[PDB]
């Protein structure tokens, strides 16, 4: 059980590192105001285990030499 | 010999006995060889008509009778008015099939002679090999020699009718150039020179060029430009000069291997102009410029550039050298042996902008050619002070601008020379013409990799002039890209960063066009604003807010 | 042990919860180019246990960007006036290369020999 | 094995017909799951199963049985038969009239899982040829229920069934674009209102389906055009032009084109 707990702790550490990096990127791109506005247009579906983003269909994501004129 | 001073009883014998047709043709040749008898021969009626009548079918078996076709109408064809009688008697049209079926029969002879060597397995000096083979070889040599002469004089009459546009159009309708190129395979100087003169005469027009292009000429002329006859090389080089205009023909020339012989002819002859013009036309694409430096062009071009004593050096050599200088492989060879020093000396002893263009093109490159240029900043900078018209200062300025070595401290040059007040003055929209101002902007950018000049640039008031220039020249992507690149130069030197951020509205102009149509302008804006964001947080917040209002613009419009 | 494991699993659920939040927000609202830029710039600091950024001006590779060759596609930067003058005038002053316009070799007089 | 199972199933359904015996139901359960598992991703198995006309003749009759699990399993089997079927298999499936019995059965289906299977099988079949769309539009109370699955409040909060309904409606709207009666019975339930909202939906498939429907219905009639104009479809249709997904882009652009040609005059 000690190995299982150690692996779980390592998973927590990796997940925390990853999400901290993600927040870094979201800070250099999206302002805090629009981070908050985005959070009001997203919902959690527990049955499927995935997010839901309303309006997912509206998100943002001559000098060539030509000497042919000489001949008539 | 039967020298005569009269007429009749000679053309009379030309339609009654085959063996004596050739002797009569030779006698007519001797009669017409001198020019004083031409008028009497022309006034002799039913004389050319009888020759044409015996000429319409007796040109396929003897070959010696094909001498009778011309050498009499030849001396007629040397005068303009007799060309009307030439179309009257239609010697051109019969000459057409004359040349055509002689070429056909020459190929037939080639194939029988080639297949007669197949009997070399058993040689017995009889009909199998030798004996009759020797006889066929002898009559071959006689027939081919006389027929080559006959073609020489026949196409000679063809040139003497080629002066007219309509006559040449009729001649080109008959697909001359095919058999013309076929005749180029023969080995005899004079007929070849008539062929190449005729072909050059046709080579100005694009219709005859298009009839020429399908069958290779350049490969046939490759083994011929080292020929020993001067007029041959002259008119052949003129013909290649007419053939360089077409791009496809020029790639044919490059792939066949015409360049080494062209450069050899450019070595030292009376063919300087023509060979050098041809070589320059080949240079006009980037692919062929690199093949020059592989011991083909030879650095002798620099030699005859150095010798030429005049106020204005000849245009052709300087143009060839300039277009050679577009490529680093030629540029490295140009500066070999320190030619750039005498290049300076010539450039500065007089106002010759063309050598300045050549060395400017030399200086656009990263290699050691850039490194050598560090020593010429004062000598160039002296003439930068608006001394010799305008067509000279631009080249000096631009040559200096491309001299981007990060280790070279420029403040000495700016305070001694370079007229920083004139740099500011030129940035006025109404000061000078736009190319000079753009070169000044390249200068302002290239003086900014040195920290010592940062304080001078910040104090000089150049930034307002740059901003006004950007505002007044925002339409063209070149000015915008280069000014924004100057801003990129000049931000992260710790002295002009503060001015740009807090005194001028430049980062706003960077916000407005963060994402423009052109990839380069947008890339420069992105890198400059990325460098701005670290030292200033308000412009960073605005940098997010804009381009977030653009990245998801329709999203926000739909929510609103 | 069961209670601790359940609490830890709840922690994992919430961690991937917010991680998916960030991933979806990036995958809908953030371009790939800016993600790559920030990924190249950033670096993790083990001492302070948080992610940091390498400043551009303080990067080890302080070698500066190389000047654009041309915004209009030439071999060198070119003013619009220079392009117009290249198009209309035969003045070699505005061109890098290809400055001479040779003429077609006009056909001479036909008199050589024989 | 596949042929043996299909033979046993068809002979059982022939010799017992529609029976409520539990053992027969369990045997047919085994057979149906076996066919669904065996036909998944095997084109050759699909062709072999569709070459047996008696098999699917036995299958289609099973849709009318009282057990809705049988309905769901037959729907899944017809799904995997109709998915990317060849010309012969499509024609053979059309011949046995599976479309009619499937879509009638959906009206009587009460379980969510069975309804999902049936509507998904209909969506797979509805793109084969215009005859399937004709049979879909010919059943009584057909479109009135097809529109009813768009606003379906799923018990398990899944968007499968609404995606299926949007896909079927897009597929069959080509015939709905030609007859006034079908458009009228669409207007009776305010279908356009549920179609426009689908543009802002959480699922991209739903947006694509809605764009397809808006493309199909807005063309060649003034009444629906002005109805869409009143509800402001022009703004959301214009915003969707530059989408990355092909179907969404074409649907939005074409719908805006049809609306553009009928500006007030």
**DSSP secondary structure of B437-480:** HHHHHHHHHHTTTSSHHHHHHHHTTHHHHHHHHHHHT-SSHHHH
A70 token code pair: 């000489």
Structure tokens at D145: 């229920």
Answer whether B59's CB lies under 8 Å from B69's CB.
yes
Burial of D3 (0-12, 13-18, 19+ CB in 10 A): middle
Q: Is residue C66 part of a domain?
A: no
CA neighbours closer than 13 Å in the CB half-sphere of residue A68: 6
Total number of residues shown for chain B: 560
Interchain CB distance below 8 Å, C77 and B481: yes
Taking CB atoms and an 8 Å limit, are A31 and B545 in contact across chains? yes
- By the 10 Å C-beta count (0-12 exposed, 13-18 middle, 19+ buried), A46 is classed as exposed
Tokens 């289906």 locate to D109
**Measured between alpha carbons, how far is B440 from B397 in angstroms, rounded to an integer?**
7
Q: What's the rounded Cα separation, in Å, for the pair B322 and B492?
A: 37
Structural contact between residues D239 and B554, judged by C-beta atoms closer than 8 angstroms: yes
Contact between B411 and B456 under an 8 Å Cβ cutoff? The reply is yes
Residues B525, B512: Cα–Cα separation, whole Å: 10
Q: Specify whether the backbone of B393 is left (phi greater than 0), alpha (psi in -120 to 50) or beta.
A: alpha
**How do strand C42-45 and strand A50-53 relate by DSSP bridges?**
unpaired
> Would you say B478 and B439 are in contact if contact means Cβ atoms under 8 Å apart?
no
Domain presence at residue C18 = yes
Distance between CA atoms of residues B474 and C58, nearest Å: 32
> Which DSSP helix (H) or strand (E) runs through A43?
strand A42-45
Whether residue C100 is contained in a domain is answered as: no
CA distance C27 to C5: 32
Residue C114 near residue B294 (C-beta atoms within 8 A):
no
3-class DSSP string for B126-156 = ECCECCHHHHHHHHHHHHHHHHHHHHHHHHH
Neighbouring C-beta atoms of residue C68, cutoff 10 Å: 18
Experimental method: cryo-EM
Neighbours of chain A (3+ CB pairs under 8 A): B, C, D
Nearest C-alpha neighbor of C93 from the set B449, B389, D19, B526: B389
Three-state secondary structure string covering B244-313 = CCCHHHHHHHHHHCHHHHHHHHCCCCCCHHHHHHHHHHHHCCHHHHHHHCCCCCCCHHHHHHHHCCCCCC
First-to-final CA distance of chain B: 113
CA distance B175 to B184: 15
Residue B223: both structure tokens together: 């083994």
Task: With beta carbons under 8 A apart, name residues in chain B contacting D242.
Answer: 554
CA dist list (Å): B308 to B146, D98, D145: 49, 96, 96
Exposure letters B521-537 (e unless 16+ CB within 10 A, then b) = bbebbbbbbbbbbbbbe
B180 vs B215: CA distance, rounded Å: 10
Question: Does A25 contact chain B (CB < 8 Å)?
Answer: no
Q: Are D202 and D241 in contact (CB under 8 A)?
A: no
**C-alpha to C-alpha distance for B89 and B25, rounded to whole angstroms:** 18
Nearest CA in chain C to B34: C114
Burial of residue B117 (CB within 10 Å: 0-12, 13-18, 19+) is exposed
Residue C36 lies in a domain: yes
Residue D75: CB partners within 8 Å, gap ≥ 6? D63, D102, D105, D114, D117, D118, D120, D121
> Is the CB of C104 less than 8 angstroms away from the CB of B280?
no
Is residue C111 in a domain?
no
Q: Show Cβ contacts of residue D246 under 8 Å, excluding neighbours closer than 6 positions.
A: none
As a whole number of angstroms, the distance between CA C98 and CA B322 comes to: 8
Q: How far apart are CA D161 and CA D169, in angstroms?
A: 12
Contact B72, B29 (CB under 8 A): yes
Tokens of B408: 């070279």
Q: Which of B234, B89, B80 is nearest to B161 (CA)?
A: B80
Alpha carbons C114 and B212: distance in angstroms, whole number: 27
Dihedral of alpha carbons B395, B398, B404, B410, sign: positive
Q: Which one-letter DSSP state was computed for residue D245? A: S
Residue D261 makes CB contacts below 8 A (sequence gap 6+) with none
Q: Check: CB of residue B320 under 8 Å from CB of residue B272.
A: no
Which 3-state string (H, E, C) describes D143-191? HHHHHHHCCCCCCCCCCHHHHHHHHHHHHHHHHHCCCHHHHHHHHCCCH
Is residue B12 exposed (0-12), middle (13-18) or buried (19+ Cβ within 10 Å)? Answer: exposed
Measured distance CA(C86)–CA(C84) in Å, rounded = 5
Q: Check if D239 contacts B (Cβ < 8 Å).
A: yes
Q: Print the domain residue range for C44.
A: 2-53
B183 Cβ neighbours under 8 A, 6+ residues apart: B99, B103, B151, B155, B191, B195
Please state whether beta strands C42-45 and C50-53 pair in parallel, antiparallel, or not at all (unpaired).
antiparallel
Q: Which domains does chain D have, with CATH numbers?
A: 1-102 (no CATH), 140-265 (1.25.10.10)
Q: Which residues of D108-125 are buried (b: 16+ CB within 10 A; e: fewer)?
A: ebeebbbbbbbbbbbbbb
Assess contact for B193 and B229: CB atoms under 8 A. Answer: yes
Q: Regarding beta strands A42-45 and A50-53, do their DSSP bridges make them parallel or antiparallel, or are they unpaired?
A: antiparallel
Tokens, residue B60: 């396929």
A47 vs D157, D202, D207: nearest CB: D157
Q: Looking at chain C, which residue has its C-alpha nearest residue B520?
A: C71
Q: Is C48 within the bounds of a domain?
A: yes
- Please list every residue in chain C whose beta carbon sits closer than 8 Å to the beta carbon of residue B357: 92, 96, 99
In contact, D43 and D6? CB cutoff 8 Å: no
Element (H, E) at B161: helix B132-161
CB D91 within 8 A of CB D123: no
Q: How many other β-carbons are positioned within 10 Å of the β-carbon of residue B279? A: 26
| Nearest by Cα to B297 from B256, B338, B325, B255 | B325
Contacts of B282 (CB under 8 A, 6+ apart): B244, B250, B253, B254, B259, B262, B288
Q: Which DSSP string corresponds to B35-71? A: GGGHHHHHHSTTSHHHHHHHHTTSSSS-SGGGGGGSS
B489 closest CA partner among B437, B456, B460, B451? B451
At residue A50, the 3 state secondary structure works out as strand
- Residue B396: CA count within 13 A, CB half-sphere: 25
Touching subunits of D (3+ CB pairs, under 8 Å) are A, B
Which residues does chain C have within 8 Å of residue A70's beta carbon, measured at their own beta carbons?
A: 104
The answer to whether the CB of B286 falls within 8 A of the CB of B326 is: yes
Determine the distance in angstroms separating the CA of A69 from the nearest CA of chain B, rounded to an integer. 11
| Secondary structure in 3-state letters for chain C | CHHHHHHHHHHHHHHHHHHHHHHHHHHHHCCHHHHHHHHHHEEEECCCCEEEECCCCCCCCCCCCCCCCCCCCCCCCCCHHHHHHHHHCCCHHHCCCCCCCCCCCCCCCCCCCC
8 Å CB contact of B156 and C114: yes
Q: Name beta bridge partners: C52.
A: C43
Please list the residues that pair with A52 across neighbouring strands: A43
Domain assignment present for C32: yes
Cα nearest neighbour of D198 on chain A: A55
Q: Shortest Cα distance from D249 to chain A (angstroms)? A: 10
Q: Identify whether C61 is part of a domain.
A: no
Query: What are the backbone angles phi and psi of residue C44, rounded to the nearest 5°?
Result: -90, 135
Report which of B325, C33, B76, B284 is spatially closest to residue A65, judged by C-alpha positions: B284
The domain tally of chain C equals 1
Do the beta carbons of residue D166 and residue D150 sit within 8 Å? yes
The C-alpha of C38 sits at a distance from chain A's nearest C-alpha, in angstroms, of: 7
């Amino acid at each position: 059980h000690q190995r299982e707990i150690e692996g779980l702790l390592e998973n927590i550490r990796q997940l925390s590192r990853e999400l901290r990096l993600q927040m870094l990127i979201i800070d250099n791109f999206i302002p805090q105001d629009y981070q908050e506005m985005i959070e009001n247009y997203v919902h959690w579906n527990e049955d499927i285990g995935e997010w839901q983003l309303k309006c997912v269909a509206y998100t943002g994501n001559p000098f060539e030499v030509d000497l042919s004129h000489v001949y008539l | 010999v039967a020298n005569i001073n009269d007429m009749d009883e000679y053309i009379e014998l030309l339609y009654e006995d085959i063996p004596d047709k050739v002797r009569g043709s030779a006698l007519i040749l001797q009669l017409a060889r001198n020019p004083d008898n031409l008028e009497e021969l022309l006034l002799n009626e039913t004389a050319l008509g009888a020759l044409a009548r015996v000429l319409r079918e007796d040109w396929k078996q003897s070959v010696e009778l094909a001498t009778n076709i011309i050498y009499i109408f030849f001396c007629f064809s040397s005068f303009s008015h007799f060309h009307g009688l030439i179309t009257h008697y239609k010697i051109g049209a019969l000459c057409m099939n004359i040349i055509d079926h002689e070429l056909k029969r020459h190929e037939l002879w080639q194939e029988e002679l080639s297949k007669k060597k197949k009997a070399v397995d058993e040689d017995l000096e009889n009909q199998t090999l030798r004996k009759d083979y020797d006889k066929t070889f002898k009559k071959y040599q006689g027939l081919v020699v006389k027929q080559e002469q006959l073609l020489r004089v026949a196409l000679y009459l063809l040139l003497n009718l080629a002066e007219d546009t309509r006559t040449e159009l009729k001649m080109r309708n008959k697909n001359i150039v095919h058999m013309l190129v076929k005749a180029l395979d023969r080995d005899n100087f004079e007929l070849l020179i008539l062929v190449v003169s005729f072909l050059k005469k046709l080579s100005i027009f694009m219709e005859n060029k298009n009839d020429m292009v399908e069958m290779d000429i350049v490969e046939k002329l490759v083994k011929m430009i080292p020929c020993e006859h001067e007029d041959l090389l002259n008119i052949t080089l003129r013909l290649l000069l007419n053939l360089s205009f077409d791009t496809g023909l020029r790639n044919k020339m490059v792939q066949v291997g015409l360049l080494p012989k062209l450069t050899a002819l450019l070595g030292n002859e009376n063919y300087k102009q023509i060979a050098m013009c041809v070589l320059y036309h080949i240079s006009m694409d980037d692919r062929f410029k690199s093949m020059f430096a592989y011991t083909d062009c030879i650095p002798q071009l620099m030699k005859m550039l150095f010798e030429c004593s005049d106020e204005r050096i000849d245009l052709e050599l300087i143009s060839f050298c300039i277009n050679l200088a577009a490529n680093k492989r030629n540029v490295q060879l140009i500066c070999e042996g320190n030619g750039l020093k005498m290049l300076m000396k010539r450039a500065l002893k007089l106002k010759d902008p063309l050598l300045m263009k050549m060395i400017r093109n030399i200086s656009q490159h990263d290699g050691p050619t850039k490194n050598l240029f560090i020593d010429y900043v004062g000598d160039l900078a002296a003439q930068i002070s608006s001394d010799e018209e305008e067509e000279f200062v631009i080249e000096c300025l631009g040559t200096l601008a491309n001299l981007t070595i990060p280790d070279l401290d420029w403040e000495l040059v700016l305070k001694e020379y370079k007229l920083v007040p004139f740099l500011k003055d030129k940035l006025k929209p109404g000061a000078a013409e736009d190319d000079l101002v753009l070169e000044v902007v390249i200068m302002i950018g290239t003086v900014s990799m040195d920290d010592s000049c940062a304080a001078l640039l910040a104090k000089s008031g150049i930034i307002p002039a740059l901003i006004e220039l950007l505002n007044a020249q925002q339409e063209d992507d070149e000015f915008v890209c280069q000014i924004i690149y100057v801003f990129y130069q000049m931000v992260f030197h710790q002295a002009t960063r503060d001015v740009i951020i807090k005194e001028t509205q430049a980062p706003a102009y960077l916000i407005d066009l963060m994402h423009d149509k052109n990839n380069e302008i947008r890339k420069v804006c992105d890198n400059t604003l990325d460098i701005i964001a670290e030292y200033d947080e308000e412009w960073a917040k605005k940098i997010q807010s804009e381009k977030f209002r653009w990245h998801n613009s329709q999203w926000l419009e739909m929510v609103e | 042990h069961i209670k601790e494991r359940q609490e830890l699993e709840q922690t994992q659920n919430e961690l991937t919860r917010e991680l998916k939040l960030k991933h979806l927000i990036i995958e809908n609202f953030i371009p790939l180019e800016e993600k790559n830029k920030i990924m190249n710039r950033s670096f993790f600091d083990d001492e302070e246990d948080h992610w940091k950024l390498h400043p551009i001006t303080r990067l080890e590779n302080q070698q500066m960007m190389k000047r654009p060759v041309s915004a209009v596609g030439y071999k060198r930067p070119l003013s619009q006036h220079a392009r117009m003058s290249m198009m209309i005038r035969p003045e070699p002053r505005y061109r890098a290369e290809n400055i001479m316009l040779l003429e077609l070799d006009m056909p001479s007089r036909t008199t050589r020999d024989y | 094995g596949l042929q043996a199972i299909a033979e046993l199933l068809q002979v059982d359904c022939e010799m017992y017909g529609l029976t409520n015996d539990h053992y027969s139901v369990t045997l047919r359960r085994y057979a149906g799951m076996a066919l669904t598992n065996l036909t998944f991703g095997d084109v050759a198995n699909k062709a072999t199963l569709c070459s047996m006309k008696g098999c699917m003749r036995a299958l289609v009759a099973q849709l009318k049985s009282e057990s809705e699990d049988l309905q769901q399993v037959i729907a899944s089997v017809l799904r995997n038969l109709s998915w990317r079927a060849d010309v012969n298999s499509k024609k053979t499936l059309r011949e046995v009239g599976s479309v009619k019995a499937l879509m009638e059965c959906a009206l009587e289906v009460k379980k969510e899982s069975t309804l999902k299977s049936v509507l998904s099988a209909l969506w797979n079949l509805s793109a084969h040829c215009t005859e399937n769309k004709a049979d879909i539009c010919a059943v009584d109370g057909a479109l009135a229920f097809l529109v009813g699955t768009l606003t379906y409040r799923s018990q398990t909060n899944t968007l499968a069934i609404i995606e299926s309904g949007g896909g079927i409606l897009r597929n069959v709207s080509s015939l709905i674009a030609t007859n006034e009666d079908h458009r009228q019975i669409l207007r009776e339930n305010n279908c356009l209102q549920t179609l426009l909202q689908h543009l802002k939906s959480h699922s991209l498939t739903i947006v694509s389906n809605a764009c397809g429907t808006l493309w199909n219905l807005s063309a060649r009639n003034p009444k629906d055009q002005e109805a869409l104009w009143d509800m402001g479809a022009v703004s959301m249709l214009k915003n969707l032009i530059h989408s990355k997904h092909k179907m969404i882009a074409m649907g939005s652009a074409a719908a805006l084109r049809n609306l553009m040609a009928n500006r007030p005059a």
